């Protein structure tokens, strides 16, 4: 068995697609639209659905806002360079909440940012 | 780059661990405690963190309830036997919101359930 995807509702489909693909480096794996239930989907990831877990972006026709709540935490992604990513994100529809830096009591470099919908994302970095 | 994990806040750590492991077939990959900030973490998944995305469960000491909100969708997992999983879940602290059956307009068997904290989970009976 395996983790297939994490589904998040977004206020603007293309807006989210752009962020995940152009800013985070994922690829648009597939999209679909359902007239009966009035929604469109976009699957984004760093590999094919058959190979990895991805993110399912759900757009409900005419719904541009949701309540984030306090239960949902975040999604964590690995990055080659957290500082660079942070910069790219802050200038491309996102928001940096926790600047790139080692975790207290550790050496692992991390950062926290938000996507265009406010969803939290954790960046974890993989002799200058 | 890769998807590391999805973090969810839970009202009872062990209860959650029990569900994901004993009911969903996941394994307890690792745990940690943070006395300073008063929280405990647990990582559960189907394989090593190094190779795949997992789930991170967070328990904040003394916090047994959160506000789910309307943004967060769910997590979809592949299942060996959807029907069987529903039963196990049914009689093991969970709720079956969508009985196992072929998807609308398809044949692929799917189901929907809720974990102990109300999180929605989609079960999908799914080079070489």
UniProtKB/Swiss-Prot annotation, chains A, B:
Gene3D superfamilies assigned to the protein according to its UniProt record, in alphabetical order: 2,3-Dihydroxybiphenyl 1,2-Dioxygenase, domain 1 (3.10.180.10)
GO annotation (BP), single: methylglyoxal catabolic process to D-lactate via S-lactoyl-glutathione
Family per similarity comment: Belongs to the glyoxalase I family.
Gene Ontology molecular-function annotations: lactoylglutathione lyase activity; nickel cation binding; protein homodimerization activity
Protein name (record): Lactoylglutathione lyase
SUPFAM superfamilies: Glyoxalase/Bleomycin resistance protein/Dihydroxybiphenyl dioxygenase
Cofactor note: Binds 1 nickel ion per subunit. In the homodimer, two nickel ions are bound between subunits. Is not active with zinc ions.
Domain VOC: 2-126
Catalytic activity: (R)-S-lactoylglutathione = methylglyoxal + glutathione
Induction: Repressed by NemR. Induced by reactive electrophilic species (RES) such as quinones, glyoxals and methylglyoxal. Up-regulated by HOCl.
Species lineage: Bacteria, Pseudomonadati, Pseudomonadota, Gammaproteobacteria, Enterobacterales
